[PDB]
RNA sequence: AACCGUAGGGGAACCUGCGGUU
RNA sequence: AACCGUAGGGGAACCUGCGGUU
């Protein structure tokens, strides 16, 4: 029964006069349904499946904006100054689209998206995380919006998972976020390894970090303490 | 940036050892 | 055998360093 959770989903997003929505990775239909009775500005569909896009000979109300290309390798800061991307994520490639919108950080301040709540549990940080995890809090806040059990889907699948909001809140400020992100992969790269191993020690012991620490043990603010050394001063 | 080659990261499909339940 | 847990095997997207070509 998609039709309840479909709706949470909208309500969760506010939309207003001005606003321009993005969803991202379809494949279902009803989800533009659903947002298209809100009070839209402009909507695009993101949908890789080049048979899917023609769906939009359902209703056709000229307010919509389908675009054919793939949604964890596009630009959005191309449509908008302020945009709200929503979707249902697939679980396979979940975690680009996520690394994705984060690229885009300045022209999107909010995006809810139905992840899995493996994947959302790690990446909210309380149960053990990934570097992920540590990206996305840099500049946004996770919050657990609500879960859902292996029957409000098209059949009734192997996992439970769970809807996910992220609103702005760039946590320190960082110049290039691909120079950001090789710096997660080269700290959680071997986890079990001490921060020594991969990071010069003369900067370990300039954090309050024990170089003999393990990267698990870090926390947000210990991942901003060293990195604004990373790039000098 | 794309694309070859190359060195890693990554960690889906599947495979098996052991344990618990039917 | 199936499902959950557990230890590995395996390695799909995708990312990154270096080199070449555009």
């Known amino acids: ?50 048979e899917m896009v023609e769906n939009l000979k359902s209703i056709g109300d000229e307010r919509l904006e389908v675009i054919n290309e793939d949604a964890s390798k596009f630009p959005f800061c191309s449509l908008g100054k302020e945009l709200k991307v929503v979707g249902n994520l697939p679980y ?3 975690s680009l689209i996520i690394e ?15 992840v899995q709540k493996e994947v959302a549990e790690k990446l909210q940080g309380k149960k053990d995380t990934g570097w992920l995890s540590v990206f996305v809090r840099t500049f946004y806040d996770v919050n657990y919006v609500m879960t ?4 409000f889907f098209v059949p009734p699948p192997k996992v439970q ?5 992220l609103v702005k809140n760039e946590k320190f ?11 997660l992969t080269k700290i959680f790269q071997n ?5 020594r191993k991969k990071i010069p020690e003369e900067l370990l012991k300039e954090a309050g970090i024990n170089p003999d620490a ?14 604004r050394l990373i790039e000098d001063s």
């Open 161 to 165: 998972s769970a809807v996910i909001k």
């Open 100 to 114: 994705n919108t984060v690229y885009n950080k300045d022209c999107v301040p909010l995006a809810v998206f139905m």
């Open 173 to 183: 400020p960082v110049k290039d976020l691909k120079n950001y992100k090789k710096f």
């Open 214 to 227: 393990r990267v698990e043990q870090l926390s947000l603010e210990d991942f901003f303490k060293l990195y």
């Open 191 to 195: 986890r079990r390894k001490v921060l």
């Open 148 to 151: 859902v059990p292996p029957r």
């Open 92 to 94: 396979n490639v979940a």
């Open 1 to 50: 029964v998609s039709e309840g959770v479909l709706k949470k989903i909208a309500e969760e997003l506010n939309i207003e006069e001005g606003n321009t929505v993005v969803e991202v990775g379809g494949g279902t239909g009803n989800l533009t349904k659903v947002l298209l009775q809100h009070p839209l500005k402009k909507l695009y569909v993101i949908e890789l499946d080049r």
